[PDB]
Amino acid sequence: SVSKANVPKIDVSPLFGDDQAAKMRVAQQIDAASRDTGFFYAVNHGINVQRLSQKTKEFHMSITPEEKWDLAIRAYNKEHQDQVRAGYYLSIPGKKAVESFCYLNPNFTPDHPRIQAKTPTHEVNVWPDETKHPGFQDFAEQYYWDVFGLSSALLKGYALALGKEENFFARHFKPDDTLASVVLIRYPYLDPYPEAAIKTAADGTKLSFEWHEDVSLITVLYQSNVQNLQVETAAGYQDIEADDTGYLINCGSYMAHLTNNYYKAPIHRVKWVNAERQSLPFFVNLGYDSVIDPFDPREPNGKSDREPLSYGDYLQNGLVSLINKNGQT
Ligand SMILES: C[C@@H](NC(=O)[C@H](CS)NC(=O)CCC[C@H](N)C(=O)O)C(=O)O
Ligand SMILES: [Fe+2]
C-alpha cells in the first residue's frame, strides 16, 4: 500500500545526433513526462555508470577522518571560510548518517575572472592527496564533463518540447562559466541505526531527507539499485522505482519559473532505508548572469506575468533556503 509512480524510460540517444524528426519524437516524451509526475529515466545515455559507482565506492571507503577535516566545508570547519559549497560534508555518528563530497566546475581556477572578483557561489575545488587516492581527481573531473555532455543533450530535448529552438537553454550552459555541481553522497548501513538520524513524515513514513523542490534548472541523478525516492501526486506520495542503469531526470524550480509552472518542479523526498548505497546528483545550473525571459506555453501569445530572474540570484537564495528548511547535509 504505497504504489509506484509512472516514471517512463526514454531513449535519449537521438538528442546526440542530427535526425531532427527523431529528436522531436524524444521531445514529445519529455513533454509528456514533465506534465505527469515530473520524472523520467534517461536510457541509452552513453555514460559508464558502473565505473562511476566503482570509483566513487573506492573513494568513500578509503577516506579517513583526518582527510575529512582537511577537506571540510565551513559548516564543519571554521578555518575554511571560502568553502561554502565545495568540499566534504561530514557525518555525525549517532546523529547524522549521511556524508558527501561536492565539487564544482573544474575551470574555476585561481585565475578565473569570477574567482578573482570573489563573486558568490563560485569557489576553487579542493581535492584529497593524489598518493592516497590515485586517479580520483582526474576521474572526477572527466565525469563532470561526461555528465555535462549528457545534460546539454537533455536541455536540447526540453527546449524542443517547449516549442523553442534546440539551443534555447544550452546556449546559457557553458564550460567556462556553469555553476553546475556534482555531489558524491554516501548513505551508510548502520546497526543499530540511530533514531536521531531518522525523520518522520506527517503520513508516518520514515525519512532521510524531507520534502522539497530542487534548486536547479534540471537534475541528472545516478543512484544505486535500492529504492528510496518518493514523489507527491494527486494520490499521495508514490514510490519511484530504482534503475541503476539509467539517469533519473526532473525539473528544478528555475524551470518552473521560466515556464509559469507548465513544467512544475516536482515535490519529492528521500525515504529512510538501512542500506549501504550511493546517490550521485548533477545539478544543472546556468551562469551567474544568465537570464531567460519567462514565458507561458499554455497562452496563445506565450506571455507570462513573471519577471526575469538571473541564475546567480536564484541559486544563492535557493541553496540557503534549502539549508534553512531541511538542514545542513
Ligand atoms: C539526491 C540527493 N539530494 C540532494 O542532493 C539534495 C536535495 S536535491 N540537494 C541539496 O541538498 C543541494 C546540494 C547543493 C550543493 N551542495 C551545491 O553547492 O551545489 C539525495 O539525498 O539522495
Ligand atoms: Fe531533490
Distance separating the N- and C-terminal Cα atoms of the chain: 30
Q: Which atom of ligand 1 is nearest to the CA of 283?
A: 19
Strands ordered across the beta sheet of 236-239: 199-200, 206-212, 268-271, 229-233, 236-239
Spell out the domain ranges in the chain: 1-329
Ligand nearest to the CA of 327: 1
Q: Which of 40, 139, 173, 209 is catalytic?
A: 209
What stretches of 90-234 adopt beta strand conformation (E)?
A: 99-103, 181-187, 199-200, 206-212, 218-223, 229-233
Q: 168-196 burial, b for 16+ CB within 10 Å, e for fewer?
A: bbbebbeeebbbbbbbbbbbbeeeeeeee
Got the DSSP string for 166-206? TTTTGGG--TTT---EEEEEEE---SSPPGGG-EE-TTS-E
Instruction: For ligand 1, atom 19, name the residue with the nearest CA.
Output: 181
Residue 46: exposure state from Cβ atoms within 10 A (0-12, 13-18, ≥19): exposed
Cis preceding linkage at 194, omega within 30 = no
Q: Please tell me what resolution, in angstroms, this structure has.
A: 1.6
Q: For residue 45, indicate whether it is catalytic.
A: no
Ligand nearest to the CA of 39: 2
Q: To which residue does cell 541509452 refer?
A: 44
- Supply the DSSP symbol for 232: E
What determination technique applies here?
A: X-ray
Ligand nearest to the CA of 123: 1
Q: How far apart are CA 164 and CA 176, in angstroms?
A: 24
Q: For residue 283, indicate whether it is catalytic.
A: no
Residues near 276 by beta carbon (within 8 Å), at least 6 away in sequence = 187, 188, 189
- Give the CATH superfamily of 1-329: B-lactam Antibiotic, Isopenicillin N Synthase; Chain (2.60.120.330)
Q: Which of 173, 257, 268, 295 is catalytic?
A: 268
Instruction: For ligand 1, atom 16, name the residue with the nearest CA.
Output: 85
Contacts 24+ apart (CB under 8 A), 70-75: 70/128, 71/101, 71/126, 71/127, 71/128, 73/102, 75/328
Q: For residue 257, indicate whether it is catalytic.
A: no
Q: How far apart are CA 201 and CA 189, in angstroms?
A: 21
- Beta bridge partners, 43, equal 11
Ligand 1 center to 320 CA (angstroms): 12
Provide the residue type at 325 as one letter. Answer: K
Nearest by Cα to 131 from 45, 40, 67, 218: 67
Q: How far apart are CA 118 and CA 139, in angstroms?
A: 28
Cα separations (Å) of 279 from 109, 244, 328? 27, 10, 17
Ligand 1 center to 150 CA (angstroms): 19
- Supply the DSSP symbol for 34: H
Asked if residue 187 belongs to a known ligand binding site, the reply is yes
Mutation pick for ligand 1 pocket among 186, 209, 240, 277 (CB with most ligand atoms within 8 Å): 209
